[PDB]
Amino acid sequence: QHFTGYIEDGRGIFYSMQNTGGNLDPLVGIMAEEIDPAVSLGQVLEKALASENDLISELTAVADRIFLGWDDDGGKGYSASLEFTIFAGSTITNQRLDKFQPTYTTGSFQLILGLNAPQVIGEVFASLASLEIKPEAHVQELEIRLDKDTRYLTQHTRNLQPGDTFHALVEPIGEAPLPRLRLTDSGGKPLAFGLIDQPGESVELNYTCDQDICELVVHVDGTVYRLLVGINAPNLREVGSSVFLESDLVTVGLAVDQIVGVDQRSENFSVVGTLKLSWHDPKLGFSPDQCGCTVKSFEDASIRAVAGEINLPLPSFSFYNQQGNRWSQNQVIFVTPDGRASYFERFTVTLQAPDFDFL
Amino acid sequence: QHFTGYIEDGRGIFYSMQNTGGNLDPLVGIMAEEIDPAVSLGQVLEKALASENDLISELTAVADRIFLGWDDDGGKGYSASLEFTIFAGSTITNQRLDKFQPTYTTGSFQLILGLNAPQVIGEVFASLASLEIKPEAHVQELEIRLDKDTRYLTQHTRNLQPGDTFHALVEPIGEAPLPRLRLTDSGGKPLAFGLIDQPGESVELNYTCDQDICELVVHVDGTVYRLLVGINAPNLREVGSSVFLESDLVTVGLAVDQIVGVDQRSENFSVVGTLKLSWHDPKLGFSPDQCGCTVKSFEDASIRAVAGEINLPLPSFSFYNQQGNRWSQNQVIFVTPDGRASYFERFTVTLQAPDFDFL
Numbered sequence: 001q002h003f004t005g006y007i008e009d010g011r012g013i014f015y016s017m018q019n020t021g022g023n024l025d026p027l028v029g030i031m032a033e034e035i036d037p038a039v040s041l042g043q044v045l046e047k048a049l050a051s052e053n054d055l056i057s058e059l060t061a062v063a064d065r066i067f068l069g070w071d072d073d074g075g076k077g078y079s080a081s082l083e084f085t086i087f088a089g090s091t092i093t094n095q096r097l098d099k100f101q102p103t104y105t106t107g108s109f110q111l112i113l114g115l116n117a118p119q120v121i122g123e124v125f126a127s128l129a130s131l132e133i134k135p136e137a138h139v140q141e142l143e144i145r146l147d148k149d150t151r152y153l154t155q156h157t158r159n160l161q162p163g164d165t166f167h168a169l170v171e172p173i174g175e176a177p178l179p180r181l182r183l184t185d186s187g188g189k190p191l192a193f194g195l196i197d198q199p200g201e202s203v204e205l206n207y208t209c210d211q212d213i214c215e216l217v218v219h220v221d222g223t224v225y226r227l228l229v230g231i232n233a234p235n236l237r238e239v240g241s242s243v244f245l246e247s248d249l250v251t252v253g254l255a256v257d258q259i260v261g262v263d264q265r266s267e268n269f270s271v272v273g274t275l276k277l278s279w280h281d282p283k284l285g286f287s288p289d290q291c292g293c294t295v296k297s298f299e300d301a302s303i304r305a306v307a308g309e310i311n312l313p314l315p316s317f318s319f320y321n322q323q324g325n326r327w328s329q330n331q332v333i334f335v336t337p338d339g340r341a342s343y344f345e346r347f348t349v350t351l352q353a354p355d356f357d358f359l
Numbered sequence: 360q361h362f363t364g365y366i367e368d369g370r371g372i373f374y375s376m377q378n379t380g381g382n383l384d385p386l387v388g389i390m391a392e393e394i395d396p397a398v399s400l401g402q403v404l405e406k407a408l409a410s411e412n413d414l415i416s417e418l419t420a421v422a423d424r425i426f427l428g429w430d431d432d433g434g435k436g437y438s439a440s441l442e443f444t445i446f447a448g449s450t451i452t453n454q455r456l457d458k459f460q461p462t463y464t465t466g467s468f469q470l471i472l473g474l475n476a477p478q479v480i481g482e483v484f485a486s487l488a489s490l491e492i493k494p495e496a497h498v499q500e501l502e503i504r505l506d507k508d509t510r511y512l513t514q515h516t517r518n519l520q521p522g523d524t525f526h527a528l529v530e531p532i533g534e535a536p537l538p539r540l541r542l543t544d545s546g547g548k549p550l551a552f553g554l555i556d557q558p559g560e561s562v563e564l565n566y567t568c569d570q571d572i573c574e575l576v577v578h579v580d581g582t583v584y585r586l587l588v589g590i591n592a593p594n595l596r597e598v599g600s601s602v603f604l605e606s607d608l609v610t611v612g613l614a615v616d617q618i619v620g621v622d623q624r625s626e627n628f629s630v631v632g633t634l635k636l637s638w639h640d641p642k643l644g645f646s647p648d649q650c651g652c653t654v655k656s657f658e659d660a661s662i663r664a665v666a667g668e669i670n671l672p673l674p675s676f677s678f679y680n681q682q683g684n685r686w687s688q689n690q691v692i693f694v695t696p697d698g699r700a701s702y703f704e705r706f707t708v709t710l711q712a713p714d715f716d717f718l
Binding site for chain 1: 410412414415435436453454456458619631647650651652653658659661686689691705707
């Protein structure tokens with residue numbers, strides 16, 4: 001038996017171990033009971049005491065009832081270890097030093113089962129199929145505006161575990177023509193289409209995945225309007241608990257430290273400042289076991305020697321009204337395991353001022 | 360059985376799978392009938408509905424009659440999969456997000472046959488030879504001008520599947536001496552020559568390939584005139600459906616954003632602008648499965664770290680009348696799977712003005 005897959009934030013697959021990428025800390029146990037235990041595991045995290053002196057021991061006490069016994073991963077020394085004589089989720093840990101906060105992790109989890117065999121630590125005894133039902137509560141709404149040019153809209157979703165549904169509904173705010181919608185694959189191949197009804201005030205699109213990875217894109221074509229997106233929402237008729245779209249939103253910040261000079265006759269000026277770009281990416285994460293550290297640092301031209309191997313897109317800016325060269329003396333990007341990256345820069349640039357009025 | 364080869368745009372080789380380079384999406388099926396089905400497959404693409412809600416299901420319905428059953432590739436999870444108990448072309452898909460448009464693909468397709476064997480998914484049961492006839496309709500005309508110096512002309516064709524012919528005919532517009540013509544290999548070795556007739560107003564050249572790849576070059580020597588080039592054109596006597604020569608035509612564009620200064624006494628000036636170079640190359644293509652993405656981006660000096668491994672020629676410009684250095688602050692090239700590449704640049708340069716007249 002050798003089965004591998006991804007585990008979402010705070011999800012438990014019901015059925016040793018090894019994380020194939022991310023920050024996953026495995027937690028494997030076999031229990032005969034079918035009573036939903038992920039509620040308590042989230043509840044174990046939820047009522048995080050103001051003093052974590054309960055937190056170190058609560059995982060030992062509560063997990064006794066959950067499975068055949070409390071079973072921590074072990075970290076680098078052991079990815080996971082389970083044994084017994086007859087919900088593979090992410091154990092609640094902390095990953096930072098400045099402030100103490102617990103949460104669950106994610107990644108790509110490999111599961112290895114050896115039945116009555118010391119070899120691990122023919123017949124398919126594993127039965128990777130589980131058919132377990134895990135109803136969700138994901139629902140979202142967006143206020144989407146049409147444009148004079150390029151009147152098509154696209155978005156993104158999260159990776160879907162098999163069996164998930166996707167209800168799509170768009171209802172215009174008022175007196176706005178129905179636009180075209182289409183669900184395709186992130187590569188570009190199409191998977192489903194929306195069939196409207198006689199009422200005409202809404203559109204319907206349905207699809208259910210059956211593959212190991214389901215990355216979905218919603219096309220809205222008009223070449224303002226309201227669009228609803230849900231996950232596992234039967235009776236969606238009549239802002240959920242969590243978000244249901246990915247993130248590429250970049251936060252910015254600039255500051256001015258000096259004004260080197262002003263040149264009236266040539267209409268330009270120079271400043272010495274600093275720049276801050278920061279965003280979120282589920283990729284480029286890392287467990288604290290690969291380095292033994294909590295933040296990773298890159299500088300100068302080694303930054304160009306990182307992402308190309310990983311092939312993940314980075315933002316690239318440009319001073320629009322700059323004349324000549326920009327002397328930047330420091331560049332640094334700090335990465336935190338969950339994915340947050342902050343990019344700083346210190347520069348000295350000459351810009352153009354075209355609103356000089358000498359009247 | 361293990362046979363590999365290239366598949367052109369909208370071509371079907373009559374006889375699992377794997378693409379060895381390009382954007383090929385395999386589509387393999389075995390049918391006893393010999394009635395030409397590629398017409399319908401092109402017709403399936405042709406009448407692309409304004410709403411593709413028919414497109415998702417049309418491939419399922421129509422392909423039922425075509426072969427032993429509709430058989431999609433599966434993408435990354437499966438290159439292709441065929442099974443049965445007793446026209447390997449490119450399935451019509453889409454590969455972009457900004458606008459929805461269907462077409463066929465191309466590449467290098469590997470075909471693997473396992474007869475009554477689960478191993479795939481001695482005796483040559485495959486019979487790669489097919490001897491099938493696929494008449495074409497390729498015909499072209501060019502208006503070629505002679506030069507005071509370097510009065511020889513060369514061109515290029517497309518890769519030819521075996522058995523193709525190549526009729527060549529050149530007839531001068533009027534009162535122009537007959538020039539020399541010669542068909543060689545892209546490496547440089549010669550393959551065929553043109554023998555003229557008593558009339559003298561035209562030349563004739565014929566060649567038929569028998570190799571797995573046929574890359575041909577037409578030499579026209581004169582060290583204006585009309586030259587005709589065709590493919591599979593018996594009775595070519597008395598601008599076809601498609602082109603029959605390759606492309607290296609570069610589109611350009613420049614814009615001016617600022618005029619930094621003017622120096623009357625030294626006769627020069629400076630500008631801050633932007634540049635756009637874009638062209639077509641059947642190489643450097645890629646399937647949307649290698650990355651899961653639709654456009655690839657490179658910047659700065661990593662661009663010099665791409666093509667050399669692939670060994671494909673790139674244009675290189677130069678500001679002819681520039682004095683000193685050119686401070687370019689951004690360089691970026693975007694690549695689309697079919698081959699289109701667009702190169703942008705933002706620069707600040709000092710140029711020379713030699714037509715100053717102070718009279």
